[PDB]
Design a protein around this nucleic acid. Structure first.
Lengths: 25, 21, 831, 830
DNA sequence: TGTATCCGCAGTATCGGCATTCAGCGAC
């Protein structure tokens, strides 16, 4: 379906950049 | 934000590689 | 022999009881009840010796001071029972000061059963053989009398005795009149005093036998003073007990016509029957009172005033009883009522062709329009202004317009109008406009789009079940997983089921009221999303508390929260029908067993409470219970004879689906904030019956009978726990006489040996001997010879005997009765 | 001693564990501490990282999805106060999606000053129900502790804090497995408390070192100044961040430090009223050198220039960014989803704005009761509008009831059209009063304000009806009220009449919600009467209620039903509720009467009060009567055949209704026929349930009947009777005979015997049993009954052997047997 | 000096009727 919502997106956008890590100001 | 452009519309891998480093 | 009075109802005074002074056969029900201020001395000079026959029933409830009923109705013979009081043809209830029944002449309660309950002094109830009176003895309810303890002295006058359930006791109504029993060669016709049989056409009794013109209660029909099998032309049967000519049935008509039609039955003539009202598919003529066939359900026809008939409440709907077409229109507007789904359907659930406009404005208590059971055409020759032909605004509870799987409805002219209906959704209107023919022959409807179909959902998808595995008591069932595009919107599944033995049940049926339900609802939590369409995840439920072999109707619907656009998702599956399996039944209830000969038992029982399937047959075993051997050791001439709740209200549902969106908004705020982008015994098998005539038996030997009810036979049959009952056979009379002359032996010291031989086939046991020596001209002294004395001595040693000739009578008392005395045993010495 | 470290700015730690290296030298943290999103960690790393010397966290603490943290004890073993000056969606402590967390561990936390706590979606959390948050927070009802592993009792919950009774149970309170939640006595409420039971100085919190000293505690309360902490810090110093006091060199350093406008972080800190505030409010302006702000030259507001063209308000952390603003330069959309009640922290934050410039869309708010938090709103200009030229837009508010108080308020909308849909508790008078008061009067299109969907669950009328004649009977009740007509008499659809039963007069007024479940008003409808074209006529309508049970209190009221339209009239009228009770009838039958015999004189009897008393039962009434024995037991020979010896909804099939139909049919045959119809030793038994009767004849039978009875001395009216047959227990020495029996000798060897019949038996002597005995044989006996005893005058013996025979004589009654006599010898010699 | 709103019950209850009862204007 790829309407990723809820905990689905926080588990599924770790997997796209699991080596670098998240970004903030 | 991210839930507004990824739970009311579809998202590409380029659009959600924008959120980390 | 007398007049034919009608049915009365006497209460609170005895003066109305004088109106039975002259009548003989009552063409009605007799009912004496509720007399408080009555003295018991006001019943000695009160007697009705002419009452012969009652045709409806007899009820006798709480008459203070009535001692016995044998001085009040001394000549009842036939209670017909063409009409009954709760399937009870004789009710005697809460009657105090009543000692015995004493109706010593009634011979045949034709159709029904007796109920005698809650009396405080009613003796003489265990000495009445109801199976010689009640032709259906199985279902009389006789409890809580004086005889709840074995206490009352029901002594008896020489009067014949028969077995009922083993207890071989005597039969009598009172202590002065016993039950008139007849041999079974005169089954219901009634025999005279000598025992020779009567004519084969009258019932109960007859004054002189073999003549049908002198009988006192006729069973088939009574014509011109005589019994008649079936009445000749041109007579008509009337109330199925007598026969009248044309002028009586006819005359009766104007009788009612002239009486406000208030308490009379307009009698019509049909198939030589004076019928109260002739049934459907038939019309009454007005010339000669016959009832003529009409093709199909024939029109009323039903005109009305000024074209408009505002149906305010159900009483306004009482003018349309059985109309077929309407030469006008209809405007229904109902707000409240009780049992409204039944009353409106019974009133106007037969209307077919409306020749105007239908209009359902402001009906608040209408949940569905399904009570128009036979509506087929709305012609529309008079339209509502604006050219409308189905006008519908402001129906607060309308949900279901019709059942569009099994219906058809043509509006030949006019348009539609559907405004301000909250619960009625767009799918029913869009289905009606293409099943009636108004989107064709194109005619512009005026249907608002935003104010139809709120607080509900009808743009749904559909679920599909996948695994229905049934058992004898439980059913587990699983369906496809469902996920809305934002997967936290789904709150849970709701599963409705209801027992339905037919296949016409739909969703919104049975409530017809405020928020009620006839279904049974359970809730299912949503499953776990394993982020994969191919997983073992799809939910299901296990219904437990069911009944075997029935048809259940089952469907399931989701419970999603409202999106912030007024867009409700969800899916309700189709109504499915499932059937549980079979199970071995319960025991056959209350078996009874009366005998009628020396080697026969008949049985009567009931079919079981829960059959749990089509019962194919029964099974019955009988075994012998020989003799109670501990009865062998009693001297009988000393004293006598030894023998979970879950309601879901509006406030709870709204609180639940508000909290289940508050949590979603908090984690949506969290995901917005934290993510920043970058720039053995024999047997018998009886089928489809409730009786059995056993044969080939020993006389007066108690049998034990086991009963089985067995539903499936061919694939390795199974059935129930056996029901146990006992039975006895009526003994033969001849088999107790002493065979041969009784031998005397004279010893010198004035003790004599009187020996005899026991009869070669007794009935049960021979318990005592009565020997009687007497000098002719002198008194008699009785001697009881015990079983033990005869067993030790092989005779009797009679002490205290002066010399001389003596007449000696010998008898042997068994468990049945007396046999006969022997010859006078003369041992003589010449003086 | 108080704070031995360094005041620390707000931090944010993610994606590693090295960034915690700057948390070893911070005792207070101005700002917030978020530790979140560490996916690849192991529990071996957290055991040797400990921050033992932080005390005060001023804003909040968010731990969202940190893997490898099992206990929170060794991380923060010393934080006492979470102040909560800038919250996070009303919550000052958010523990979210901690997967590896076992215990809460925060054993030294005392005071959460402002805010609540939300602990949600943990899979392995326990020791959660033994914390007593009511001694930690100051407001408990806004918490959210839901969806943990403590939904089911499976995680221990054993611990060795005097087991408070703040709920209806007796539960111990404990943070961890080896620590308990520190509770001390309440002679000082929350003023700091030392462990051994002595209260320390009042201006401190939590732990203390020595009592009655405000110089050596650990967490002050009001402010803090250089070792001590006083209530009002002296004016060589100024207030700062509402917890410190600093001199003006520091505020000047901050101002001249971040006046270099290269970043968007700080504020231009000014001094005002001894407060180093970020910006002093409207009506003030800052001189450059002095750093204070003086009153403004005339009136000047603080324009709150809104980002992105609109602002949505969800909670406290979004309503705190409009703090002190006066005019808003953009639209404001109020949306408070879910919630319990939030009208207390909105009024102190956004209850000072005066001119919004866009619209005020109020949608989906569930916990809103009134808009009274908009305290000083006056002008809605509407330069930017909504889709369709709207300025006030209320849509789907489940609990809105009152917009303002129009007796003491003013509001002007310049342009645009107002909109009102789905407000199902809001009366129609409020929006029409708003159209009257405000500037918009005729700028509507039909239909914009939905006249049908508002106020349908709130009965809202202004006129009232009065009842003129209330007649009362025992079954039916009569009503007749005063006529009512709207100014257009063709606009009336009829009355509605609600009635219910309630024995207690504390019935609340009707709330609009038509009750339907179990406790509900029954509603009937009345058609409107016929127009009589005259003032004084038959215009009084009426009604007659028929199915009512006698002697109970009924609460009734009436209401009208009219059709709304464009004219602001025909609201309707509604009477106040009244209470009428019906009359009393004859009562029911006394239920379940049992008679129990114990001795030869006592008989006890009990029953139950009837099912339908129909009034307060005054007294019962018991009559009894001596039945005599059967005369047919007097003239029979009784050693023939026969001897006497007296003494969830569970929905099933409703096809069983016919037996109860029989019983209720005879009960209604009582009632429908008793609408028309109204020496013996007795006693007026009053206020009892059992009865003893002593001192009567033995073994005889009595018929007894009992009635219940209501009010007595004027016109005695009791029910129908109930009948019981009773029999007492027998006596021992009644049928036994004493005295010498006498034998008489006849010449024809028929021997006569004389005895006495017993003078009183237990009921009736029925047989005499004489037996004679010799030595060697058994006893041979003989029947004799009353007729043979009378006609033989004793008993005669026929034809026995000569010698000496012993005689033994019994008597048996219908109750049983008696004993023998002395064996007397009768002898003949030959 | 009488006359005069039923709404859904009454029950062996079919088609059109009447219970329930405090009241003073309108002709007769």
């Amino acid at each position: 379906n790829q309407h990723l919502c809820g905990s689905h997106l926080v588990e599924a956008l770790y997997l796209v950049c699991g080596e670098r890590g998240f970004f903030y100001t | 934000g991210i839930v507004e452009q990824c739970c009311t519309s579809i998202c590409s891998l380029y659009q959600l590689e924008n959120y980390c480093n | 022999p007398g007049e034919v009075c009608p049915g009365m109802d006497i209460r609170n005074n005895l003066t109305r009881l004088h109106e039975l002074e002259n009548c003989s056969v009552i063409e009605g029900h007799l009912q004496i009840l509720l007399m408080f201020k009555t003295r018991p001395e006001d019943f000695r000079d009160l007697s009705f010796p002419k009452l012969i026959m009652i045709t409806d029933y007899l009820l006798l409830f709480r008459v203070y001071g009535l001692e016995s009923l044998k001085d009040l109705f001394p000549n009842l013979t036939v209670i017909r029972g063409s009409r009954l009081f709760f399937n009870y043809a004789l009710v005697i209830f809460e009657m105090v000061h009543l000692k015995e029944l004493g109706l010593y002449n009634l011979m045949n309660i034709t159709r029904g059963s007796v109920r005698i309950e809650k009396n405080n002094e009613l003796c003489y109830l265990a000495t009445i053989d109801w199976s010689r009176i009640l032709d259906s003895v199985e279902d009389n309810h006789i409890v809580l009398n004086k005889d709840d303890n074995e206490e009352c002295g029901d002594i008896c006058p020489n009067c014949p005795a028969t077995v009922i359930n083993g207890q071989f006791v005597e039969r009598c109504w009172t202590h002065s009149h016993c039950q008139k029993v007849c041999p079974t060669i005169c089954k219901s016709h009634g025999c005279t005093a000598e025992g020779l049989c009567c004519h084969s056409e009258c019932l109960g009794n007859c004054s002189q036998p073999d003549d049908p013109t002198k009988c006192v209660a006729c069973r088939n029909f009574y014509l011109d003073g005589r019994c008649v099998e079936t009445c000749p032309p041109p007579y008509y049967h009337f109330q199925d007990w007598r026969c009248v000519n044309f002028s009586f049935c006819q005359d009766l008509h104007h009788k009612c016509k002239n009486s406000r039609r208030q308490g009379c039955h307009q009698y019509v003539i049909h198939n030589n029957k004076c019928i109260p009202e002739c049934p459907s598919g038939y019309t009454m003529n007005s010339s000669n009172l016959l009832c003529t066939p009409c093709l199909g359900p024939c029109p009323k026809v039903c005109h009305l005033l000024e074209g408009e008939k505002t149906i305010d409440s159900v009483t306004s709907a009482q003018e349309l009883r059985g109309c077929t077409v309407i030469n006008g229109s209809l405007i229904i507007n109902i707000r409240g009522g009780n049992n409204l789904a039944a009353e409106l359907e019974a009133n106007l659930g037969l209307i077919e062709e409306i020749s105007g406009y239908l209009k359902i404005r402001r009906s608040y208590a209408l949940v569905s329009l399904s009570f128009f059971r036979k509506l087929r055409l709305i012609r529309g020759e008079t339209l509502e202004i604006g050219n409308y032909s189905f006008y519908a605004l402001d129906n607060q509870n309308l949900r279901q317009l019709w059942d569009w799987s099994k219906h058809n409805l043509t509006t030949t002219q006019g348009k539609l109008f559907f405004h301000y209906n909250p619960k009625l959704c767009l799918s029913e209107i869009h289905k009606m406009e293409e099943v009636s023919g108004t989107k064709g022959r194109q005619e512009r409807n005026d249907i608002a789009l935003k104010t139809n179909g709120d607080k509900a959902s009808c743009e749904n998808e559909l679920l599909k079940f996948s695994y229905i595995r049934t058992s004898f008591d439980k059913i587990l069932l699983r369906w496809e997983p469902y996920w809305p595009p934002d997967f936290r919107d789904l709150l849970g599944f709701m599963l409705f089921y209801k027992e339905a033995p037919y296949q016409n049940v739909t969703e919104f049926d049975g409530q017809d009221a405020c928020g009620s339900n006839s279904w049974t609802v359970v809730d299912i939590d949503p499953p776990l999303r394993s982020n994969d369409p191919k997983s073992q995840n799809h939910p299901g439920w296990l219904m437990r508390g069911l009944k075997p072999w029935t048809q259940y109707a089952i469907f399931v619907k989701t419970l999603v929260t409202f999106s912030d656009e007024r867009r409700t998702y969800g899916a309700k599956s189709d109504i499915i029908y499932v059937q549980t399996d079979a199970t071995n039944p319960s025991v056959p209830l209350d078996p009874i067993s009366v005998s009628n000969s020396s080697s026969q038992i008949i049985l009567k029982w009931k079919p079981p409470s829960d059959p749990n399937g089509n019962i194919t047959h029964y099974l019955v075993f009988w075994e012998r219970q020989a003799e109670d051997s501990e009865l062998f050791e009693l001297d009988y001439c000393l004293k006598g004879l030894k023998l979970c709740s879950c309601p879901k209200t509006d406030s709870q549902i709204l609180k639940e689906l508000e909290e289940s969106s508050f949590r979603k908004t908090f984690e949506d705020y969290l995901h917005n904030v934290v993510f920043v982008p970058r720039p053995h015994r024999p047997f018998e098998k009886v089928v489809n019956k409730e009786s059995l005539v056993i044969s080939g038996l020993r006389h007066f030997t108690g049998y034990r009978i086991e009963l089985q009810a067995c539903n499936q036979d061919t694939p390795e049959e199974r059935c129930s726990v056996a029901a146990y009952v006992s039975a006895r056979t009526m003994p033969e009379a001849k088999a107790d006489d002493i065979v041969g002359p009784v031998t005397h032996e004279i010893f010198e010291n004035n003790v004599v040996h009187l020996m005899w031989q026991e009869p070669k086939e007794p009935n049960g046991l021979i318990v005592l001997y009565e020997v009687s020596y007497r000098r002719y001209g002198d008194e008699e002294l009785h001697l009881c010879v015990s079983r033990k004395h005869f067993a030790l001595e092989r005779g009797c040693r009679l002490r205290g005997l002066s010399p001389g000739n003596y007449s000696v009578r010998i008898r042997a008392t068994s468990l049945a009765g007396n046999g006969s005395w022997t010859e006078p045993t003369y041992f003589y010495v010449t003086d």
